[PDB]
Amino acid sequence: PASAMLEVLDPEQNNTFTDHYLDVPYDLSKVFFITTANTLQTIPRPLLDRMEVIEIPGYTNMEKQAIARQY
Amino acid sequence: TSLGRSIARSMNRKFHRISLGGVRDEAEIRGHRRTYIGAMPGKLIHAMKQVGVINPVILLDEIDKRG
Numbered sequence: 001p002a003s004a005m006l007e008v009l010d011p012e013q014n015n016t017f018t019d020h021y022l023d024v025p026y027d028l029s030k031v032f033f034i035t036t037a038n039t040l041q042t043i044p045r046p047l048l049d050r051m052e053v054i055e056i057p058g059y060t061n062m063e064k065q066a067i068a069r070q071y
Numbered sequence: 072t073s074l075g076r077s078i079a080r081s082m083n084r085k086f087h088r089i090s091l092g093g094v095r096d097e098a099e100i101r102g103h104r105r106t107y108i109g110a111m112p113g114k115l116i117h118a119m120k121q122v123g124v125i126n127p128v129i130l131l132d133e134i135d136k137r138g
């Protein structure tokens with residue numbers, strides 16, 4: 001279901017998109033998803049083309065101590 | 072791939088990339104038999120559906136990378 005969620009990622013095709021159960025035009029264009037990914041190799045190439053990648057380094061024990069104490 | 076849009080705009084013909092390479096079987100290029108449950112046509116004719124004309128341009132990406 002790649003194009004099934006490309007059609008909802010892009011707000012232009014949702015202007016009059018009708019689901020197979022509701023069959024009435026509806027504008028799902030005001031949503032702007034921000035997503036998190038665990039693995040990127042398995043993500044399709046067109047999907048990886050339209051998103052910008054941001055990488056989280058990790059954590060240290062010194063930071064973890066403060067995280068646990070304060071949060 | 073940008074050459075695809077350049078050529079299509081020169082021709083003023085509709086362009087639609089089709090994501091291949093990651094496929095594994097034959098029943099997805101051409102729709103599997105209607106008898107098997109959940110019969111759906113092949114991705115190709117899906118792209119043919121997406122366009123409203125009989126002469127679009129289709130790009131077949133990275134073909135050089137069980138059915």
Ligand SMILES: Nc1ncnc2c1ncn2[C@@H]1O[C@H](COP(=O)(O)OP(=O)(O)O)[C@@H](O)[C@H]1O
Pocket residue numbers: 072073074
């Ligand atoms: N000389 C050039 N003029 C215009 N765009 C260029 C040129 N060289 C590279 N590009 C850009 O390179 C990018 C390549 O993306 P794409 O065609 O999808 O790559 P690929 O064919 O490897 O999948 C496009 O954004 C294209 O416009």
